[PDB]
Amino acid sequence: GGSQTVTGGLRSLYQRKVLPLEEAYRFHEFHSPALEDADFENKPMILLVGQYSTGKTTFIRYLLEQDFPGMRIGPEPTTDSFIAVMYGETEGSTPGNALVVDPKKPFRKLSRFGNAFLNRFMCSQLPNQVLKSISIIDSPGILISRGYDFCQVLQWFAERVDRIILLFDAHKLDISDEFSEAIKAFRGQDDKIRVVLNKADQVDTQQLMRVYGALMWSLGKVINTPEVLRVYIGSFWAQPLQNTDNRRLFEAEAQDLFRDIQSLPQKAAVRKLNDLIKRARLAKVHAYIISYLKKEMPNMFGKENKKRELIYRLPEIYVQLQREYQISAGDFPEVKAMQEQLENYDFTKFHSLKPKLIEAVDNMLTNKISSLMGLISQE
Amino acid sequence: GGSQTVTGGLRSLYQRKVLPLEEAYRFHEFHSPALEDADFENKPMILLVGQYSTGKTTFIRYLLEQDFPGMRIGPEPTTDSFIAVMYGETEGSTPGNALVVDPKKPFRKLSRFGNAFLNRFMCSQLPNQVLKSISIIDSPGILISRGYDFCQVLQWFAERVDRIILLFDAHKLDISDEFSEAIKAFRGQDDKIRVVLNKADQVDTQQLMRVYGALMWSLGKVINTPEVLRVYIGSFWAQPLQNTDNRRLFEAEAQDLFRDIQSLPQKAAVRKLNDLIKRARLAKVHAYIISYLKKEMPNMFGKENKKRELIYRLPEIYVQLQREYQISAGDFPEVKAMQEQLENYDFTKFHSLKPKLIEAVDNMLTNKISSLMGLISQE
Numbered sequence A, B: 001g002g003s004q005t006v007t008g009g010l011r012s013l014y015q016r017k018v019l020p021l022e023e024a025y026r027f028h029e030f031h032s033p034a035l036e037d038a039d040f041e042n043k044p045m046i047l048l049v050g051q052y053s054t055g056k057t058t059f060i061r062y063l064l065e066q067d068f069p070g071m072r073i074g075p076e077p078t079t080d081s082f083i084a085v086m087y088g089e090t091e092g093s094t095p096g097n098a099l100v101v102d103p104k105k106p107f108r109k110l111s112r113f114g115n116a117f118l119n120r121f122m123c124s125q126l127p128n129q130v131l132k133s134i135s136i137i138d139s140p141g142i143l144i145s146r147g148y149d150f151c152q153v154l155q156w157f158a159e160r161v162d163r164i165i166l167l168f169d170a171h172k173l174d175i176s177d178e179f180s181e182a183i184k185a186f187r188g189q190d191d192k193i194r195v196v197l198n199k200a201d202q203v204d205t206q207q208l209m210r211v212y213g214a215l216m217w218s219l220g221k222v223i224n225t226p227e228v229l230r231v232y233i234g235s236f237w238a239q240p241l242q243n244t245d246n247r248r249l250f251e252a253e254a255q256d257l258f259r260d261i262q263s264l265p266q267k268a269a270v271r272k273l274n275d276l277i278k279r280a281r282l283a284k285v286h287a288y289i290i291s292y293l294k295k296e297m298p299n300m301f302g303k304e305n306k307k308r309e310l311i312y313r314l315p316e317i318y319v320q321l322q323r324e325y326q327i328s329a330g331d332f333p334e335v336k337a338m339q340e341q342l343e344n345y346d347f348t349k350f351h352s353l354k355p356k357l358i359e360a361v362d363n364m365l366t367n368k369i370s371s372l373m374g375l376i377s378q379e
């Protein structure tokens, strides 16, 4: 919702202040192409991983407080499939065979699995408050042999998703080997993982402590990290509670979960803002480099010879610029990769240093960002 | 209390039915010496392991519902020491320098640590209901450098103890490396370990689930076994509760703990009963062997020659006896170790087979034990 003001603030600041300095010095031919509007409007995604009949699909319904197309509660394993729940003007759905082609979607690379997975993948779209801020990806309930590498497709989402929610149900915690194998594939991104102990009101209080204890026992035994994961304990659906002895607990745990999900878009706005700052700093360095190569060329003759001196001397050039501009050697591009790319360029064609374009980036980093953060402080 | 009838039942059954068959064939010179009354009156022991200020010493007080000599609640680390709490006619105490000498105590082997440990070891004795059935061993609170191998002495108790209770406190779960090292030394006896999450009423319900989750997370991470340990959650002392939201839970967990401790003496009576059965079966086999060696000797000459034939043929003798007595090859002594020991014996001196002595053991295994178990069924 209001995050659209932040998205528009980055786009505006980039196109006005940063993109001119990138274009003037062929930034897009050395390091990274120009940012499209798709690089600013990305919403955070959540991946739901869990075994069959744990409550993933109902969990989504609970958050949306509304049904979504093709939800199918309690389906057959063969029919159970991946679903990308995303915002839409009208309640519709899109099969995975066409969703893979959509250039305005981050699912274009999924085409590499093809056929058997695409017949098990779709995008259900609906106008919903929750979906204006995040997207949710329901995975098939872990159980006999599918038609696609089920682990790699889970591992594929896990890398591009902002939050991974492992779901278990207290009424029948049966952590399997297929599930363990999946969680091991998620290692290296533990900072994205959160757990949900579902159906916690179906058992008595003691059994809840037995199951919850077993869950954490065999989790640390798998993930093998000192940083203990957060588990949200509760019954996540609209129905009344069965065992009410832990009512206060389940409600507090649901709020901690709501606050975590509701924080994701603000967390992404911060990440995008830092990326724009780092790109801006890299465009300055690139500009200082190209400008120094142009400045040192001769007025007429010895061009091809001088071009090779400068490339051979490029490491010394870095230090030369790190000293007379008080810039860190960290946000300098790799030395050798530059040398390799500078061969294909006529250094005389480069532009000279444009102070106007650098001041446009500097006054952005000092004045314009402090306000943009404030827009993120008021979530 | 009533377990004294079981102890006397084993002693009686052994001395009347088993010991005669052992003596008649020099069982005590081949396999194991005669059982003393100390081998029947052993009470089960519990080892308390935990960090400083967790509540070990108060835990004991809570179970005894009574103070014990030298309890010292909340002491200095240097003064904190091992304490063997055992039954006694009068409330007294015994320093470890003299307790090590007591032949009627299982602490005689502890003398190998000596001096620095003995100055940190004592036996507090008092007439108490709990102590008529079990003994408790309080260990120093884990925290700088003592005067004895603190890990090996913990590891020493762990092997001879029936129940090991790891204690943590919810108000400050700080599992340390010294504590982790100890728990790793206890591996290979996980069936003895139980956990106690103490002071569980000092935190709020959510923090209890956070701490309890961390405890099990880093426990399975250490012990590395599929069999998840049992944790008893509660506040184990006579004071009122602070956070009463989990009153029903803490009371149920305390009862599960009381039932576990109260089951130990009955569990030991079963183990002793099985040992007496296995010893009885070994004495029969030993008797059949010695008797067969006697039976096959010559009436006058060729004695030393025949003695060597029988020892060389001893493997064949086993099968010969396994067939005409329908006995398992499992409870036969090691072949080679017998051969080595039979060298020092005049086979002509052995007794012949005494059916009276074997029938005394057989009618024990069929009639007398079925009743002795019944005495254990009514705990």
Ligand SMILES: Nc1ncnc2c1ncn2[C@@H]1O[C@H](COP(=O)(O)OP(=O)(O)OP(O)(O)=S)[C@@H](O)[C@H]1O
Pocket (backbone or CB within 6 Å): A050, A051, A052, A053, A054, A055, A056, A057, A058, A059, A071, A072, A073, A074, A075, A080, A138, A139, A140, A141, A198, A199, A202, A235, A236, A237
């Ligand atoms: N909080 C809950 N408490 C009790 N039962 C629940 C709860 N949530 C879901 N269920 C039931 O659990 C069963 C499985 O429901 P689902 O939500 O479909 O689980 P799921 O299989 O993980 O979702 P899929 O596979 O993506 S359709 C249904 O019969 C639900 O009624």
Ligand SMILES: Nc1ncnc2c1ncn2[C@@H]1O[C@H](COP(=O)(O)OP(=O)(O)OP(O)(O)=S)[C@@H](O)[C@H]1O
Pocket (backbone or CB within 6 Å): B050, B051, B052, B053, B054, B055, B056, B057, B058, B059, B071, B072, B073, B074, B075, B080, B138, B139, B140, B141, B198, B199, B202, B235, B236, B237
């Ligand atoms: N259930 C409990 N709830 C709250 N505080 C407790 C509880 N049990 C003990 N304490 C307090 O914890 C502190 C440490 O007490 P101790 O029982 O001596 O712990 P301990 O150090 O493990 O025992 P030692 O070292 O063998 S003397 C004391 O101040 C007690 O009052």
Ligand SMILES: [Mg+2]
Pocket (backbone or CB within 6 Å): A055, A056, A057, A058, A059, A060, A138
């Ligand atoms: Mg689902």
Ligand SMILES: [Mg+2]
Pocket (backbone or CB within 6 Å): B055, B056, B057, B058, B059, B060, B138
């Ligand atoms: Mg103590």
